[PDB]
Design a protein around this ligand. Structure first.
Ligand SMILES: [Fe+3]
Ligand SMILES: [Fe+3]
Ligand SMILES: [Fe+3]
Ligand SMILES: [Fe+3]
Lengths: 320, 320
């Protein structure tokens, strides 16, 4: 039962070395002359200053043309579905990162979560820019609300929410580790179906404006995955009494499930009607990412049959 | 008793016009194609993009010299006291703005609070830069910890915390309005003693490096005061059943008290030993700011005898 740190604790540890990710005894003054988690502070500077960007300084002259005329009915359908879902995710993220930040006892980590929260706000801004630019008013509202029409979308949403609401409802150390694992999956996996879609269009000279935006969001997402990787790993060291077998189990299940559901989504969005990728490929990408992410947090691959990356080209395309 | 909005509400209002600052019924998807609070969204763009800045791109070559040799024992004392306190305030702010953000039901306002939270993180970074630059390692740790020595500082801190902890402990609509009023005072008042100090040094060519930093923090602070002014005013319209007489009373008391305690601080810091301002001036500044701020949230002046600004010159100096 995670007690939320009070605003000022005069009986708080002076030694940065005594800091913990959770359940530490801080003053809650940001004593940033001493850093225990150099990665937390490095990631703050990287997200907050180095990688700063302005959505509206990206030019949206073309895409509205290509949307208006050059895109197939299936290509427009995927565009709507992917943007609707990513809008939902980034919305959940700005809201939920405030729950993590208020529970974390290392100020440098709180700093890194604050910057991540701000990056999620900019993403929300970028999607609003993309739609204000690329499509008409009614279509933009419809895309924001596409869950109101599409039960596969509505369910993806309610499901992601559920895991976060457990921790909000019942803020215990188990529901914390579960929520944190949820965050890592959501940013590990659930963005890269969408990222892959847009980078396909972009390979063939389709929607290069949108794809610029996405390159920045994707640069930010890799920082976010790295932050939560370190938090989960540091959480394992500092709190092994939380990575019980029952949990280490529930992790690998959800991590497999999630790799599944991302594929059932990638396939619903596209339906092999998109010139550049197919239901087979989808499966080899998510399976690939999923292994990686789970191994990067100290677990055995969940799909050993996969070891190459189907789309190794992305790594070079998405670059800025 | 403010129930904290769940992460996704499929029974949430579609019409932006139905949004409320608190106790609204949102989906918690950031439907930013429709804005009800244009000021909230304007303030987000202003804080997040327009006014972006990097503390470390400000040059800190000189100040360490002027600190090392050119500053009186009283001038060094004020420097330590003011920086120690402002470090404490910005720390409280990054932490507490997460409590407001999670309670607010208008996404554009949540967006504006997220950006403010990020600006508070940058301030934390700026103070760490200032001390890493301007003073030696042991002195920097001592300044972060100056509350551990100085009971006037320790009490200022515990007092600000107290008001925030009430709302955290007992998150009801009264403790919400109290906490929110606390935020407005803290950013209205408690920064401008410090701001005034540093701008004095800076007038006489003392610590112009620090003073650059402060100009940026002060530009950010005016955005923050404006945000909470609008929130309190919009809260009055949307929730008059909260600005009871008992509250409207407790407001004017605290607002007067706070103008008092800022002066008892300004005077402890300086002690008329600082060439540029005196215990009399201090009193005419805080009394001036305090009236203004309380009138700007629809109240009668608390010090009518004051109507001019003692230090009208600041407005022009602090500019960038
Ligand atoms: Fe995002
Ligand atoms: Fe993210
Ligand atoms: Fe600040
Ligand atoms: Fe502020």
């Amino acid at each position: 039962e995670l007690v939320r740190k009070l605003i000022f604790n005069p009986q708080g540890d002076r030694e940065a070395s005594k800091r913990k990710i959770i359940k530490g005894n801080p003053t809650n003054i940001f004593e940033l002359n001493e850093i225990k988690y150099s990665w937390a502070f490095d990631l703050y500077k990287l997200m907050g200053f180095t990688n700063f960007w302005i959505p509206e300084e990206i030019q949206m002259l073309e895409d509205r043309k290509q949307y208006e005329t050059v895109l197939s009915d299936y290509e427009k359908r995927a565009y709507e579905l992917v943007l609707s879902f990513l809008i939902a995710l980034d919305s959940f993220q700005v809201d939920m990162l405030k729950e993590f930040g208020r529970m974390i006892t290392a100020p440098e980590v709180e700093m890194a979560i604050t910057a991540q929260e701000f990056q999620e706000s900019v993403h929300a801004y970028s999607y609003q820019f993309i739609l204000e630019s690329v499509v008409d008013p009614v279509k933009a509202d419809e895309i924001y609300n596409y869950w109101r029409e599409d039960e596969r979308l509505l369910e993806r949403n309610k499901v992601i929410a559920e895991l976060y609401n457990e921790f909000i409802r019942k803020p215990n150390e188990e529901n914390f580790i579960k929520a944190t694992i949820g965050n890592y999956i959501l940013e590990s996996l659930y963005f890269y179906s969408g990222f892959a879609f847009f980078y396909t269009l972009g390979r063939q000279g389709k929607m290069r404006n949108t794809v610029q935006q996405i390159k920045y969001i994707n640069r930010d997402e890799l920082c976010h995955v790295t932050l939560f990787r370190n938090i989960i790993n540091t959480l394992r060291k500092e709190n092994p009494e939380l990575f019980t077998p029952e949990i280490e189990k529930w992790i690998v299940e959800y991590f497999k499930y999630a790799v599944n559901e991302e594929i059932k989504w990638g396939q619903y969005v596209t339906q092999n009607q998109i010139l550049g990728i197919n239901d087979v490929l989808i499966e080899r990408y998510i399976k690939y990412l999923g292994n990686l992410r789970i191994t990067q947090i100290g677990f055995d691959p969940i799909y050993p049959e996969v070891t190459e990356n189907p789309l190794k080209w992305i790594d070079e395309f998405r670059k800025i």
